[PDB]
C-alpha cells in the first residue's frame, strides 16, 4: 500500500528544483561522511540552530548535545559507521520545505568477551526534515529520524559470532533487535518507539513527513 | 577488454548536460528508494507509458504488471531490498537518450525451516534505458535490465545458514546462483537468460546499450 | 577531534558551486563504475595526464601503468569490486581545486584451497585530489589515495571461511589487515604506509588535503 497521500517534486522539474534536490541530497550524505570522520564543523553545518536528531541509543537530542555525547562515545571506543545506499528528495517549492530520504546501513563494530569482534548491520532509511532560508536560499536540516528495516549480526573473522537470547532480543521492534540489544550491552538506554517497515509509527512517520511538506509544524516527539 | 565502442557524455560538460545526467541518476535511484518503501505513485513516475522491466523472478514484465505482482509478492511476505552502490550516466544529447548505470546490491531476506533467516546479497548493475520528452524535457525510463556480478548467502544471526546442493545451484548463471536458487524455493520461475560479468549476453547488453544511445530501437527481448 | 583546520565550500552555495561539486562527485564514482566494468576509456577520462593513484596491492602507480597492471590482474582472475557508500566534495573556488570524499567498501572475491570462496570487505574512504582546467572548466583527478577504516572476512556460502594466523595479520595496519593478508596470498607486495582511522598518516592525509585546497603542491609520496 502506497504510504504517500500526494506527490511532490521528486524527479525532473526545473533547473532550480533539480539544484534544490541536489543541495538537500548533500545535507543527507553529510551525516555518514562527516560524523564517521569526526568532521564536526562540517557535521554541525548541516543543521538549523534549533535542530533535533533521534537515534536508537540517544533518543531525541538537540544537535549540539548529540555532538557532545557522540564525541564521548567515540572517546570510549564506540565505532559506528554508515554506508549510504540511495538518496532522493521530496521538494515542496512554495513551502521552502523538503524531505531527504536516505537509505543506509548503520554498521557498528562491537566486541564480546581473544575477544569476538562483530558488526551489527541495520538497513534503515534516514529522513531529513529540511527547510530553506528565504534570505540565504540555504537548505538546513531541522530534524533527522529513521525508519529501521532489518538487521543482522556480521562475523568479522568469518567463524565467530556473539549469541543473543530470545528474551534479550524480544523487547526491541523487529528491524533493529540486534542493534538495540548490542548497544544496550554497552550501557545505553534504547529508544523502543522508533518506526520500522510496518505499523503505527510507520504511518505516523509518513503523516509527519507530509505535514512538514505542507508547511506545518510537525510532532516527532512521541513520548509526550 | 573495454566493452564500449565509443565515448558519450559522462563527466563534466555543460550545465545542461550535468543537469540531464543528474535527472537520469535520480530516476535510477527511484527503484531502490520507491520500490523498497512501496511508494507506488513515485515508482510509476520513473517510467514511460510503454516501459518494460526484467528481473530474475519475473522475467520481462510491462511496468504496471510488474507493480501488480510486486504488491502480491510483498503481501505474501516477499522481502527484497536494494542498496545503491554507485550511479553514473551515459548521455547522448542529440538523440535525447541516456543510459543510467546503477551499481547495487539486491538484498533479499528469506527463511528456511525456529526457522533459519538468511539474506542473499547479489552485487549487480541496473541499466536504465532512458529517453527525454522533447515537449516536456522530462526524462523517463523505457527499459530496466541488470548485469548480475556475484552473490553470497548471508547468515542473519551469524551462526546458521541454509544449504544448497551443487545440483540446485548448477542451472543458474554464475553471478546469481544463490539468488536464483533461493527465489525458486519460493515458487518463482527464474529467468536464466540474464547477463553476468562475461560472455555472450554481456556483449549483447553493451550492444543494445550503444544502439539505444545511437537512437535506435533496441532488442532486449532475448527469448524470441 | 575535528581533523579539518578550516571550512570549504561543501553544501549549498551558488549554482556554479553546486555544479562543480556535482562534477567532482561524478569523477569519484567513476572508479567503482568504470574500473569494475573494465570501461577503460571512461576510467582514463577521470584523470589528469600526470595522475598517480595508490592502492594496497600496487602502491603508487602512474594511472596508465595502473591500468596496465589492473588489466593483467583481471586476466589472472583477480576480482575486486567497489560499493560506493556516500560521496561529498570540499571545493576551493578561487584555487580551482577540490577534494572528493567517497566512502566505499572494497569487496574482493578470493578462493582458498571444492575450494572455499570468500570476500574481504574493507570500508574505506577514497580521497580524490581534483583540479579544474581554467581553459575548459573541466575537473580531473590528479591523485587518488584512501583511508582504510575496517575490514572483515565474508563467507560466500554462509558456512565456510578461510583462516588467518595472528602473525599473518600482524604486519598490516588495523583497518586493512584481512585485505592485505589475502592480497599478499596472491603474490602482491602490500603497501604498509596507508592511512587508517587514527595516527600519524591520518593527520598527514588531512594536512595534504588542506594543502591541495590551498593551492599548493602536495606530498603524497610517503616512502621518500
Ligand atoms: Ca536553490
Ligand atoms: Ca496532514
Ligand atoms: Ca508529541
Ligand atoms: Ca534538462
Ligand atoms: Ca550497433
Ligand atoms: Ca529479440
Ligand atoms: Ca563548472
Ligand atoms: Ca598547510
Ligand atoms: Ca615525500
Ligand atoms: K550509494
Author numbering:
A (entry chain A), B (entry chain A), C (entry chain A): 5 to 117, 133 to 243
Recite the paper's sentences.
AGDC1 and PPP2 fit in none of these categories as both enzymes neither display cofactors bound to their active sites nor require the styrene motif or ATP hydrolysis. Instead, they act on the carboxyl-group directly attached to the aromatic ring. Intriguingly, these enzymes’ catalytic mechanism is a new type of decarboxylation mechanism combining acid–base catalysis by a His-Asp dyad with a sophisticated web of hydrogen bonds and a double tryptophan twisting clamp. The trimers of AGDC1 and PPP2 in the crystal structures represent the functional biological unit, evidenced by the size exclusion chromatography data and the extensive intermonomer buried surfaces and interactions.
Finally, the AGDC1 homolog from Madurella mycetomatis, PPP2 (GenBank: KXX81388.1, sharing 52% protein sequence identity with AGDC1), crystallized with only one molecule per AU in the space group P321, and its crystal structure was phased by single-wavelength anomalous dispersion (SAD) of the Se-Met derivatized protein. Apo-PPP2 had one molecule in the asymmetric unit (AU) in the space group P321 and was solved at 1.7 Å resolution by SAD. PPP2 has high protein sequence homology to AGDC1, with 63% overall similarity and 51% identity. Expectedly, the PPP2 crystal structure matches closely that of AGDC1 (Cα RMSD: 1 Å). The main difference arises from an additional flexible, 17 residue-loop between β-strands β4 and β5 of PPP2, which had no associated electron density in the crystal structure. In contrast, helix α4 of AGDC1 is absent in PPP2, being replaced instead by a shorter segment without a secondary structure. While the potassium ion is also at the center of the PPP2 trimer, no divalent metal-binding sites, equivalent to those of Co2+ in AGDC1, were found in the PPP2 structure, conforming with the enzyme activity being unaffected by Co2+. E88 is conserved in PPP2, and the potassium binding site in PPP2 is identical to that described for AGDC1, but the occupancy of potassium in PPP2 was 19% compared to 100% for AGDC1 after occupancy refinement in Phenix31. The lower potassium occupancy in PPP2 is probably due to the differences in crystallization conditions: 200 mM potassium salt for AGDC1 vs. its absence (200 mM CaCl2 instead) for PPP2 crystals. The cobalt binding site of AGDC1 is missing in PPP2, in which a serine side chain (S52 in PPP2) replaces the crucial E49.
